[PDB]
């Protein structure tokens, strides 16, 4: 722990938890949001026999544990799970006590207000954090980009959000949430791999196939033409070496998996591709600034490490929108940490401690005070 009473910066992103100290450039403890529980009961002795397993421990013990998600698309299952994982993060991973450091947290866009009230109340009772602040990840990604104008595409693991912000002003009237995310990607890839001869249901293979998505997946420039040329495609077809050692070969599926977000009709969504959701979002607001939105679009999330989103994005928007002004996307490398960086940025300036949510305000007005203290 630093000698100074600097604040805690924790991004509880929908899919990854990244925690550390204020003034740091990158979060120190970063782990996926999976939680493992003993698949069977206790009869043995001498070691183990522990209920909750979180972090890399559960990653190593994936096979023996039922792998469960305490949060999915924002919905909260069991607050005890968050209690334990935050205990682990603060003491076993961050080696910090929350008594002496206020916490800045980031929440998924348009999270329930009742969810905020309950989570804040359990937090304040269970923990002894001196002060509090929670913010939407959209403005955090904006801060990471450091440009007040643009539309943020936050692609988490449970929801994809499109949020327009002009000159550092939120536009909730033009903000939308789409239920397509990593979960859907894994599902669709699971069914295609089932049609390829490999049919698995458990979560270990879920992580294997999301790793495959991280490594080999394409974003098709032209879809049906690329499957037409991918009929044989000995060179274009790509293989992976699974940890057991078998060589699993995939061809068109590499660019037929992310395509589903662009083409939701593959597995039955009324909503069109996410580019349509950015398009409608843009036109909902006044006409004039729309061009700037076209030229200032930002994309954020862990998924963004994949190739192909930028070219597809610009080409389709230019197809939909007039091609007079030039559209260009901006995306700094390793932007999944960017939100946490913005949290540090929030703690950088000396005005931030004017609106810390202190203990006594919550003791006076209950959780309801946040309704007036954040917004």
């Amino acid at each position: 722990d630093e000698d100074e009473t600097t604040a805690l910066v924790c991004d509880n992103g929908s899919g990854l938890v990244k925690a550390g100290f204020a003034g740091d450039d990158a979060p120190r403890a970063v782990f996926p949001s999976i939680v493992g529980r003993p698949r069977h009961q206790g009869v043995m002795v001498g070691m183990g026999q522990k209920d909750s397993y979180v972090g890399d421990e559960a990653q190593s013990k994936r096979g023996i544990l039922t792998l469960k998600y305490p949060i999915e698309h924002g919905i909260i299952t069991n607050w005890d799970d968050m209690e334990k994982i935050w205990h682990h993060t603060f003491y076993n991973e961050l080696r910090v006590a929350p008594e002496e450091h206020p916490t800045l947290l980031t929440e998924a866009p348009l999270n329930p207000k009742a969810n905020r009230e309950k989570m804040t109340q359990i937090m304040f009772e269970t923990f002894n954090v001196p002060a509090m602040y929670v913010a939407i990840q959209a403005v955090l990604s904006l801060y990471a980009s450091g440009r007040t104008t643009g539309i943020v595409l936050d692609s988490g693991d449970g929801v994809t959000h499109n949020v327009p912000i002009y000159e550092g002003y939120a536009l909730p009237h033009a903000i939308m949430r789409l239920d397509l995310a990593g979960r859907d990607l894994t599902d669709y890839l699971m069914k295609i791999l089932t049609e390829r001869g490999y049919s698995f249901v458990t979560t270990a293979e879920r992580e294997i196939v999301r790793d495959i998505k991280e490594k080999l997946c394409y974003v098709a420039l032209d879809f049906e033409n690329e499957m037409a040329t991918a009929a044989s495609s000995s060179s274009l077809e790509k293989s992976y070496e699974l940890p057991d050692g078998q060589v699993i070969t995939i061809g068109n599926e590499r660019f037929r998996c992310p395509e589903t977000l662009f083409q939701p009709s593959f597995i039955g969504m009324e909503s069109a591709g996410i580019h349509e959701t950015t398009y409608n979002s843009i036109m909902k607001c006044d006409i004039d600034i729309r061009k700037d939105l076209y030229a200032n679009n930002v994309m954020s999330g862990g998924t963004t490490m994949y190739p192909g989103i930028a070219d597809r994005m610009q080409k389709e928007i230019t197809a939909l929108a007039p091609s007079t002004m030039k559209i260009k996307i901006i995306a700094p490398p390793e932007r999944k940490y960017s939100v946490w960086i913005g949290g540090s940025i929030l703690a950088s300036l000396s005005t931030f401690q004017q609106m810390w949510i202190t203990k006594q305000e919550y003791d006076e007005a209950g959780p309801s005070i946040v309704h007036r203290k954040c917004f």
């Binding site: 490594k215 080999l216 070496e241 190739p307 192909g308």
Partner: protein, 56 residues
């Protein structure tokens, strides 16, 4: 009895040799497996860079 003692001595010598060679094999085995774990890592990563060439 003397011949039994000589044979027992030789057998014990051989058995201690067995155990020492087994330990040496163990150490070598661990080192080779690690070497290879990191070899496959660096090979995969060179391939990933080549994938970068494809994205370019």
């Amino acid at each position: 009895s003397d011949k039994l003692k000589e044979a027992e001595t030789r057998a014990e010598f051989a058995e201690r040799s067995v155990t020492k060679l087994e330990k040496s094999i163990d150490d070598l085995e661990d080192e080779l497996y690690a070497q290879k774990l990191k070899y496959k890592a660096i090979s995969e990563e060179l391939d990933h860079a080549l994938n970068d060439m494809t994205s370019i």
